[PDB]
Amino acid sequence: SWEVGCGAPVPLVTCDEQSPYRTITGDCNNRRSPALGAANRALARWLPAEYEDGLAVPFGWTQRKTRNGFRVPLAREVSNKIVGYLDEEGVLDQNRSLLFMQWGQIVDHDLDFAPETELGSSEHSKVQCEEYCVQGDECFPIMFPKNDPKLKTQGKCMPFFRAGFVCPTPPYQSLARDQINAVTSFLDASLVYGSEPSLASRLRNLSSPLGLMAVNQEAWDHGLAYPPFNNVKPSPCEFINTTAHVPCFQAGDSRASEQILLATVHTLLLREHNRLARELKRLNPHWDGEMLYQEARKILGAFIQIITFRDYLPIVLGSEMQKWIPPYQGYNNSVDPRISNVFTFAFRFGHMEVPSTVSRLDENYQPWGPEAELPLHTLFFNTWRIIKDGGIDPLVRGLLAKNSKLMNQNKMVTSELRNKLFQPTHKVHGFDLAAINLQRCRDHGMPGYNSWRGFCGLSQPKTLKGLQAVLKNKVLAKKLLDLYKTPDNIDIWIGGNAEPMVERGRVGPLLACLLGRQFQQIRDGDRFWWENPGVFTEKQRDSLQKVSFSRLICDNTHITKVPLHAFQANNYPHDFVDCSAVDKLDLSPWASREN
Numbered sequence: 097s098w099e100v101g102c103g104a105p106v107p108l109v110t111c112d113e114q115s116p117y118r119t120i121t122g123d124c125n126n127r128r129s130p131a132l133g134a135a136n137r138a139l140a141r142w143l144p145a146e147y148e149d150g151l152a153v154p155f156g157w158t159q160r161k162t163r164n165g166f167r168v169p170l171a172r173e174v175s176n177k178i179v180g181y182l183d184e185e186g187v188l189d190q191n192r193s194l195l196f197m198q199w200g201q202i203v204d205h206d207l208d209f210a211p212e213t214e215l216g217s218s219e220h221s222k223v224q225c226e227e228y229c230v231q232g233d234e235c236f237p238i239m240f241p242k243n244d245p246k247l248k249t250q251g252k253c254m255p256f257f258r259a260g261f262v263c264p265t266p267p268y269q270s271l272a273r274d275q276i277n278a279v280t281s282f283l284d285a286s287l288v289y290g291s292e293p294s295l296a297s298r299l300r301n302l303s304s305p306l307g308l309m310a311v312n313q314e315a316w317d318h319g320l321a322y323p324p325f326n327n328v329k330p331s332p333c334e335f336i337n338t339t340a341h342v343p344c345f346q347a348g349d350s351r352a353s354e355q356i357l358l359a360t361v362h363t364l365l366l367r368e369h370n371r372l373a374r375e376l377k378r379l380n381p382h383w384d385g386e387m388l389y390q391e392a393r394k395i396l397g398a399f400i401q402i403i404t405f406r407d408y409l410p411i412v413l414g415s416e417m418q419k420w421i422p423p424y425q426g427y428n429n430s431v432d433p434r435i436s437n438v439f440t441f442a443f444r445f446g447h448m449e450v451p452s453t454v455s456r457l458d459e460n461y462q463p464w465g466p467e468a469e470l471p472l473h474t475l476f477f478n479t480w481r482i483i484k485d486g487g488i489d490p491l492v493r494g495l496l497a498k499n500s501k502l503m504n505q506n507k508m509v510t511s512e513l514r515n516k517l518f519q520p521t522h523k524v525h526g527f528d529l530a531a532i533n534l535q536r537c538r539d540h541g542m543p544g545y546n547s548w549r550g551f552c553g554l555s556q557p558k559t560l561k562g563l564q565a566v567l568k569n570k571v572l573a574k575k576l577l578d579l580y581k582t583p584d585n586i587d588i589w590i591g592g593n594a595e596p597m598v599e600r601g602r603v604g605p606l607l608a609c610l611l612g613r614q615f616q617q618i619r620d621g622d623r624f625w626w627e628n629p630g631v632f633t634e635k636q637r638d639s640l641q642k643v644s645f646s647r648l649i650c651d652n653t654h655i656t657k658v659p660l661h662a663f664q665a666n667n668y669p670h671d672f673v674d675c676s677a678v679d680k681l682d683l684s685p686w687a688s689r690e691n
């Protein structure tokens with residue numbers, strides 16, 4: 097529209113063009129248009145951004161400025177009146193393991209990250225956001241409404257700093273503000289490997305020709321590997337226990353240690369990598385580290401894609417899976433593979449699937465120790481609970497035998513996330529994910545709920561009575577309309593999530609459309625898609641076709657009792673089999689022939 101293309105990206109990329117491997121940054125996936133899908137580019141705008149000034153100023157900023165003739169409600173007020181609930185009883189999903197939630201988070205982290213602006217590591221203005229709660233520049237604090245208990249305890253607000261945007265980091269005043277996606281759009285295990293060359297390299301084991309990802313040298317898990325510690329201080333995993341002195345983990349994605357089960361699945365993936373590297377060395381002793389790394393990386397890449405696309409997506413999207421992600425018909429170099437700005441909110445449906453506790457299960461799948469169960473809020477940036485209290489295995493058994501929170505129109509987000517979120521740099525277990533999601537919709541310039549309804553070719557309710565029929569909930573519809581005066585103002589995150597789930601799925605129609613499209617595009621638009629003719633051999637594919645999250649567990653833990661269908665709710669011992677009953681990854685087709 098404006099300037100041909102914006103001036104100040106990562107400008108130096110030379111496409112090999114013959115390379116059989118994905119670049120780290122994701123550049124060179126598309127040949128005609130090489131920046132497509134690459135990390136640290138602008139998130140895609142499926143619809144034009146909507147900001148109160150049309151450019152950058154988020155709705156809700158200027159008191160006197162309406163959205164469609166109405167004040168937008170306080171994020172935190174929306175949280176309190178709609179998102180919140182007291183009673184955790186009866187909230188569990190009777191057919192989705194805890195792993196179903198966790199896998200979402202994993203996948204999510206592979207696809208998008210719009211980090212908060214730096215605008216200066218030296219910042220008394222950072223202190224001006226937290227302490228004085230004054231709105232300015234990139235400080236966009238979440239003010240507590242009147243009647244809010246955090247008011248009595250936490251001051252006037254929750255600090256909140258605006259997401260980064262492309263072109264410059266300091267001001268931009270031409271095209272509408274586009275936030276950055278710091279990770280590669282492609283489903284390619286970038287959460288394990290990195291989306292930049294530094295980290296990709298820091299993460300690697302460059303101490304031997306083995307193609308290993310670097311592992312923790314301080315600690316071990318009954319002989320199994322941990323990721324390296326992130327030695328940059330301040331470490332918020334250090335901050336949450338002064339005594340334990342256990343730092344956050346160091347992975348391809350900076351959020352890995354955000355919660356203990358995310359760290360857990362990260363650890364499983366790292367392990368898998370190294371495991372794969374080692375078999376490739378047995379099978380191919382002639383190979384340099386580089387080729388071990390890459391080929392392992394690529395298997396791992398495909399594993400994540402299969403589990404996601406074969407096992408995960410069908411149980412999210414349900415009866416819509418087929419309508420949005422039909423059978424693969426090969427790579428198409430015209431499909432846009434970028435993550436959209438809206439997706440990054442759509443995929444936050446997962447916030448409502450997170451239960452209030454996490455458990456450690458012993459080898460009989462019973463409470464491992466006296467504190468088996470723990471509140472979720474005590475596990476944010478909590479690595480010590482893995483290192484100094486049982487390792488990966490008891491958490492993993494928890495992931496299999498425990499349940500995801502069912503999303504519920506009267507019980508949206510657990511107070512673990514909604515009132516007790518810990519954020520790094522900040523000090524309290526006292527933050528609101530739901531409120532944060534909402535301020536962020538706004539921060540990102542999101543079109544309203546009805547815009548997205550229009551987009552998905554869905555009815556656009558204009559009335560209370562209209563909203564009730566779409567939401568299938570009178571009270572919910574009233575609450576929302578009492579805050580947002582028009583469904584046109586409902587923030588996409590809360591609106592989409594407000595919708596009843598599709599048959600066999602776990603998101604409503606609007607979301608299923610948004611998610612389904614994105615995932616269709618990331619598959620169809622990916623040259624390196626595992627199932628694209630030529631990427632793997634057709635023998636290799638018959639091998640890959642049998643992967644399972646269960647198998648991954650078996651291989652990279654000492655969990656010997658696993659379910660066949662890891663994502664559904666599974667009770668021990670009935671639904672559990674021995675690892676022996678579970679199909680293996682046959683790396684035979686990876687035997688190399690020089691002669």
Ligand code: HEM
Binds near residue numbers: 211439443476
């Ligand atoms: C205990 C579990 C979880 C914790 C503590 C958590 C925490 C967070 C936090 C603090 C953010 C940044 C919010 C912001 O400032 O905008 C975030 C972003 C997000 N989360 Fe959640 N989350 C959890 C589970 C999930 C699940 C289960 C999913 C999806 C299934 C999910 C999807 C996302 C997405 C897509 C983003 C935006 C990423 C981006 O910046 O592009 N997370 N998560």
Ligand SMILES: *[C@@H]1O[C@H](CO)[C@@H](O[C@@H]2O[C@H](CO)[C@@H](O)[C@H](O)[C@H]2NC(C)=O)[C@H](O)[C@H]1NC(C)=O
Binds near residue numbers: 339340480
């Ligand atoms: C900080 O982590 C330390 C490190 O373990 C915890 O202390 C341990 O507590 C358990 C019982 O829960 C004992 O089995 C260990 O022997 C204790 N170790 C030490 C060094 O005291 C402590 O609970 C953690 N504290 C907080 C506040 O989270």
Ligand SMILES: *[C@@H]1O[C@H](CO)[C@@H](O)[C@H](O)[C@H]1NC(C)=O
Binds near residue numbers: 301303304308310
């Ligand atoms: C790299 O691999 C070598 C050989 O296995 C191992 O001795 C070394 O500890 C590894 N280094 C790191 C940081 O993992």
Ligand SMILES: *[C@@H]1O[C@H](CO)[C@@H](O)[C@H](O)[C@H]1NC(C)=O
Binds near residue numbers: 428429430
């Ligand atoms: C590839 O995608 C584009 C746009 O969605 C469409 O124009 C095209 O016809 C598709 N390609 C093939 C080979 O069917």
Ligand SMILES: *[C@@H]1O[C@H](CO)[C@@H](O)[C@H](O)[C@H]1NC(C)=O
Binds near residue numbers: 191
């Ligand atoms: C549980 O969900 C799975 C799909 O994940 C489905 O095949 C199965 O029929 C479901 N079982 C029940 C009892 O709903």
Ligand SMILES: [NH3+]CCc1ccccc1
Binds near residue numbers: 351518519
């Ligand atoms: N998934 C969100 C990860 C996260 C949590 C807290 C601060 C930064 C990032």
Ligand SMILES: [Ca+2]
Binds near residue numbers: 279281282283284287
């Ligand atoms: Ca990626």
